[PDB]
Design an enzyme around this catalytic site. Sequence first.
Site, PDB file in Angstrom:
ATOM      1  N   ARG A   1       1.647  -5.561   1.787  1.00 17.39           N
ATOM      2  CA  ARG A   1       1.288  -4.212   2.205  1.00 17.39           C
ATOM      3  C   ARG A   1       1.013  -3.279   1.035  1.00 17.39           C
ATOM      4  O   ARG A   1       0.681  -2.112   1.263  1.00 17.39           O
ATOM      5  CB  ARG A   1       2.389  -3.627   3.092  1.00 17.39           C
ATOM      6  CG  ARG A   1       2.265  -4.027   4.553  1.00 17.39           C
ATOM      7  CD  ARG A   1       3.394  -3.459   5.388  1.00 17.39           C
ATOM      8  NE  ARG A   1       3.930  -4.444   6.321  1.00 17.39           N
ATOM      9  CZ  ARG A   1       3.675  -4.480   7.622  1.00 17.39           C
ATOM     10  NH1 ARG A   1       2.874  -3.600   8.198  1.00 17.39           N
ATOM     11  NH2 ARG A   1       4.239  -5.425   8.365  1.00 17.39           N
ATOM     12  N   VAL A   2       1.139  -3.755  -0.199  1.00 17.88           N
ATOM     13  CA  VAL A   2       0.801  -2.968  -1.375  1.00 17.88           C
ATOM     14  C   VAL A   2      -0.584  -3.319  -1.901  1.00 17.88           C
ATOM     15  O   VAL A   2      -1.306  -2.446  -2.382  1.00 17.88           O
ATOM     16  CB  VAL A   2       1.879  -3.159  -2.464  1.00 17.88           C
ATOM     17  CG1 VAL A   2       1.568  -2.301  -3.675  1.00 17.88           C
ATOM     18  CG2 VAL A   2       3.252  -2.825  -1.907  1.00 17.88           C
TER      19      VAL A   2
END
Lengths: 118, 114, 50, 60, 51, 49, 100, 222, 150
Positions: G27-28
């Site tokens: 998710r980064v």
Amino acid sequence: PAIVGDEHYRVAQEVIRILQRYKDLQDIIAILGIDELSEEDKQLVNRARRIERFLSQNMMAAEQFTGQPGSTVPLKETIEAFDKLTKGEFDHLPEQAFFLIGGLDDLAKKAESLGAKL
Amino acid sequence: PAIVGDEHYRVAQEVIRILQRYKDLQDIIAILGIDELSEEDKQLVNRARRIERFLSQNMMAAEQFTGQPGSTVPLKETIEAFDKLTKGEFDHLPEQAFFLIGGLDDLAKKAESL
Amino acid sequence: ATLRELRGRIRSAGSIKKITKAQELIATSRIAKAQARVEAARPYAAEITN
Amino acid sequence: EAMLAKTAADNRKSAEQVAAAQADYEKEMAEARAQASALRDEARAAGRSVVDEKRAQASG
Amino acid sequence: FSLLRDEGKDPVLYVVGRKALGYFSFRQRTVVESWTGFSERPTYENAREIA
Amino acid sequence: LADADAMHAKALADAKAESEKVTEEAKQDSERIAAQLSEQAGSEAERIK
Amino acid sequence: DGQCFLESDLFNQGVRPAINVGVSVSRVGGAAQIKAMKEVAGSLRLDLSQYRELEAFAAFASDLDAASKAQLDRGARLVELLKQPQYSPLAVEEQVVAIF
Amino acid sequence: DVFYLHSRLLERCAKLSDELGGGSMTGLPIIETKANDISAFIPTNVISITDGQCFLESDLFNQGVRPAINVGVSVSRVGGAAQIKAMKEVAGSLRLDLSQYRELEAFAAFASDLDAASKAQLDRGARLVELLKQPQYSPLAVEEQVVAIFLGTQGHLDSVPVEDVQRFESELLEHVKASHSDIFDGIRETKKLSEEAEEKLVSVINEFKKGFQASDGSSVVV
Amino acid sequence: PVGDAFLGRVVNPLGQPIDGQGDIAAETRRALELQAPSVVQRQSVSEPLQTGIKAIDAMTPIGRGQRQLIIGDRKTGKTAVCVDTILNQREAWLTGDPKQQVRCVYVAIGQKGTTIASVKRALEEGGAMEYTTIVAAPASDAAGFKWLAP
Ligand SMILES: Nc1ncnc2c1ncn2[C@@H]1O[C@H](COP(=O)(O)OP(=O)(O)OP(=O)(O)O)[C@@H](O)[C@H]1O
Ligand SMILES: [Mg+2]
């Protein structure tokens, strides 16, 4: 049709119908392969794969995940493009040309990059 | 057989076998057409059609709908009639002759009526 | 989610069954046609053999 | 010889004209039917526009 | 092929249909010529060409 | 050939007449549809008011 | 903030680590990669997801168009490239060169 | 007592006897299924309680069949007792025709291989399925429904392309309503389709077919 | 409260108007738990109730006094079918004959208020509010109101 108009509604319904038929045929394609489908069903399967790829889009907020800048498509362009797709006007282009792009100009550029002419 | 007797069981099994084969051939009849079948298949289709129409009966409760009254077929008469039918001894009769009747006497009476 | 995948598999198997049954009947008709063609070809073979 | 050739040509022409009579009949009737259908469709569209415009005017 | 090899011969292969083509392609056996697209309903012209 | 040409011309004239009749019917139907839809729009105007 | 899904079916196939690329995500994203890695691996995950989709779809295709065949070849090579034995770390630059 | 809840609610919908004035209340309960699980507790109870079910399905809806009623499983236990004579006559063959069509759908692309009867059944079923489609907010009067089903079940749509059926029907229903309303009036007043009315309707249908245009430029006559 | 004044009104499960159109003149009062008509107080359902939908009216016809379930997943067109039935009753209403007129009651349980408003607008557009009453128990209402609205 009352709110979005007849053209938008008809194009959306045709897209939904094609995708529903493709979903129905997915298991048969997985087991027996596409070659055992009727010619019209083969055409519909190709159209549906292209349509489902074209529904994808490179988003402004998705760049951080892909490195590709996002894009925006006007509603009229979207309706026209999906009307053309549902009629098989882009059947000659590879399905990969329809993946994560914006409008028809992006489609033409990507198809040219992939060795095909829109 | 230990309950209903050997003859009853044999006749019932023959009827069930004929009806099952007819059900199996139903798909070919429906799609490829009756003429597509072999001659033995056609013979069995005719016999099964007659058997299945003979299983129909004129019921007492049906008299309130059609003026004709009901029929009560004794078990022995039913057994012998269906044994004869499975042997193909009534295959030449018209199909309608096997509709909504009792035993063999009713079958003959309706056969003469046609 | 075992039940959901089981229902999906049931749907897939039903579709496969329908397609295979249709193909079986079509193959029956095609057998009829092929046998007819063999019979049609027989006389020329006989005459040329003689 | 010219009379025989002309007879053959005239028989062919008679056949093709008996066919072309029906062909042109069908073509012209198809054209007239298409005109009628277009007139009906445009009348329906004009009525739809009338009702929609009157809806907007009544709402205002 | 086994019989022919036991008889001191070499098989030169011709194929009708695609399944045999794939089989021999996997086996890497060479196919001199292949005719495909008429196995379901062959005409006399195909047989004439093959012969 | 002469009879075929005459019959062709007669068929052409009959086609003219029949096309005229059908286009006339189309005119009547179009005007009727226009009037009926105008009446419907007026009735709905009354409902809105 | 994302997950690495590991499958026994992938593990037995020789895909080690047995990461299910389709449903595994960070998710980064690129913010967690150096610029070189972000450049050479910008769309690797999406490419492999599409490759798996095509491989499932074209499992029994008698004949494939040139584009689909090229995609399948590229995806197979990428899958082989991502395989890695245990206790065999790669420096970031080595990973960049391999993904290049 | 949840079953009791719904059953006590729904048994108040009744057709009263003549002694009590002959009034009636018709219930149309709505039930939302999850993943089309009609076996859930509340759907099971309500299905057991009611006199008939209209099962609506998402797959049918996405296929363009709107209203998305699954005729195969939908039932009405009252049945023909709740229909007028004309609807009973015209709609008699609909159920068997649609069942045969669903059986034959697997052979859509093998119509040439199918014998004449099977191909005719396939085409009739396709046309009937097109006929049962209906736009939203547009209910039809019983006479118009009778005429449309008459078109479907008498073979008058056999010559019409499937993709045009709907349009055809609508236009036809318009045409009659503008020029031959006596057919609708007769159906409404007598609740049956008389022989004279039927033949007049057939002649009107043939003339309209002479006047109608298929979307693909073909002709629908004969 | 019960009476003819409830036609065209939106009320809550207690009969209190929520449409802002003022009071409702009640003919009388009815207890919610009065017994249903007995087995010997009825007669066979024989009069058609035309929904105006060809599929229903031909395949699964509905008679007056029948309980016909409309069951399906979300967004399958159930409310559409019911609203179409209510709209179809308009010609029968205009006939003016009580033997043909059908009075419609639409009970909304758990729907969001704007959805009930959309349904009411649809009914008004077709002139169905003249003979239709809406009992509304929106999602914001207490569980008791949702339980009692039917
Ligand atoms: N006959 C029809 N033709 C076309 N569209 C229809 C038809 N019936 C319903 N729709 C559309 O289908 C969608 C769902 O309709 P509707 O809201 O009536 O369904 P529902 O099952 O009651 O939904 P929900 O789960 O929201 O309560 C809406 O867009 C409605 O306009
Ligand atoms: Mg709803």
